[PDB]
Amino acid sequence: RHSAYNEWKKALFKPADVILDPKTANPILLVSEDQRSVQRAKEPQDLPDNPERFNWHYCVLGCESFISGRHYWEVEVGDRKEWHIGVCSKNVQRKGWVKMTPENGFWTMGLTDGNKYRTLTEPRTNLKLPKPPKKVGVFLDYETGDISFYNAVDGSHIHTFLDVSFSEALYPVFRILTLEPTALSICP
Amino acid sequence: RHSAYNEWKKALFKPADVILDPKTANPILLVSEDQRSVQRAKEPQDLPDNPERFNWHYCVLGCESFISGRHYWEVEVGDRKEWHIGVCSKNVQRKGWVKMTPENGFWTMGLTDGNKYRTLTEPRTNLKLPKPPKKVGVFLDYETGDISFYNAVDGSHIHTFLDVSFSEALYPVFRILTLEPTALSICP
């Protein structure tokens, strides 16, 4: 619509046209043909363990990273009960486990158990949201170091990582743990 | 709050610090000492009929006009039953009546009879709003020729005048017709 959110987002942030990178996706994940959506398999599929593939975390990256400027993309979470989204550094550990935290180069928030919204921080912070979002705007300002999440239907705030001193390229990152009927999808 | 509306308005538009100009105010209007608020008198007060004073329309202007750039200010309408706000050209007719319309250099919207939201256009357009606003953001982009009005509490759209070819300086303008307990006030 013509809400200040919808009208101004592109005046202020360049719209990322985020395409999921199948080379990065944990083998338990399915990337849609159009590369906009991700689902989970009952079992890991048989894929190479090429270096760019997350082999433990149920993660997938966008094809393109950012090293400067202002950028946004939107994700339809719909009625999923579990998801995490945000950005991560190019050089995160993709083989084995590391805690997904800003100290290990992940800046993400999401939902677990249907209704626990949280930042993936050390320690985890609980978010109290006016309503459950269906669509989440993810907003990067590389130079000020701000990663902001909004409800993309009413423009309400969800969370901001403030004043981070990024020194790596940053990828859109997505994680799904659960096997559910609703996918996680990028709006183009 | 940290809504996209509140966070982004100042990144994109310079906040006007709009002060009411008592020299411009129809003598039936009272301008507050702090020059942020306007009320109506039962009767016209005794004032000079200096050239900058609106002598028929129950109008008052901001002290400063714009000839370029992006600007905004916010107005608390509260539970008033009647008000109109927007911008007008420096050279509007201030002595006698002219219809307040874009053709006569007024770009305004507002409320009449408690619940008829309308643009002051020829002909008048009725606005259907999700909810009655309490605070209205007024947004000027001189070069693209856009004057946009938002609900300043949830960032929802109210109205836009699109692609106007301004060639005069533009003043914030305000009009109140009714005698009611609630004033019309500028947020600083």
Residue numbers in the entry:
A (entry chain A), B (entry chain A): 18 to 205
The article reads:
BTN3A1 has the structure of a type I receptor of the Ig superfamily and is part of a family of seven BTN receptors encoded by genes in the MHC. BTN molecules are composed of two Ig domains (IgV, IgC2), a single transmembrane domain, and a large carboxyl-terminal domain termed B30.2 (or PRYSPRY) located in the cell cytoplasm. More recently, the activation of human Vγ9/Vδ2 T cells has been linked to BTN3A1. Published reports show that BTN3A1 acts as an Ag presentation molecule for HMB-PP and IPP, but the mechanism remains poorly understood.
Therefore, we investigated the structure and binding interactions of the BTN3A1 B30.2 domain. The crystal structure, like that of the B30.2 domains of TRIM21 and TRIM5 (13), shows it to be composed of layered antiparallel β sheets with variable loops, a structure homologous to the Ig fold. The juxtaposition of B30.2 domain variable loop residues forms the specific binding interface. The BTN3A1 B30.2 domain structure has also been presented by Sandstrom et al., who identified a credible pocket implicated in binding pAg ligand, characterized by a cluster of positively charged residues. In addition to the residues highlighted by Sandstrom et al., particularly arginine residues at R412, R418, and R469, histidines H351 and H378 and the single lysine K393, our apo structure suggests a role in coordinating Ag for tryptophan residues W350 and W391. In particular, the indole of W391 may form a hydrogen bond with phosphates in the bound ligand. Binding of HMB-PP and IPP to the BTN3A1 B30.2 domain was investigated by ITC. HMB-PP was found to bind with an affinity of 1.1 μM and IPP with an affinity of 672 μM, values that are similar to those reported and that help explain the 1000- to 10,000-fold difference in bioactivity of the two molecules on human γδ T cells. IFN-γ production from T cells was rescued by coculture with wild-type BTN3A1 and N115D re-expression, but not by the B30.2 domain variants H351R and W391A, nor by the Δexon5 and ΔLL deletions. In addition, the IFN-γ recovery response to HMB-PP by reconstituted wild-type cells was less efficient than for zoledronate. These data therefore provide functional confirmation of the critical requirement for the B30.2 domain, of key residues within this domain implicated in pAg binding and for the BTN3A1 periplakin interaction motif residues, in pAg-dependent activation of γδ T cells, with the likelihood that additional unidentified factors are required.
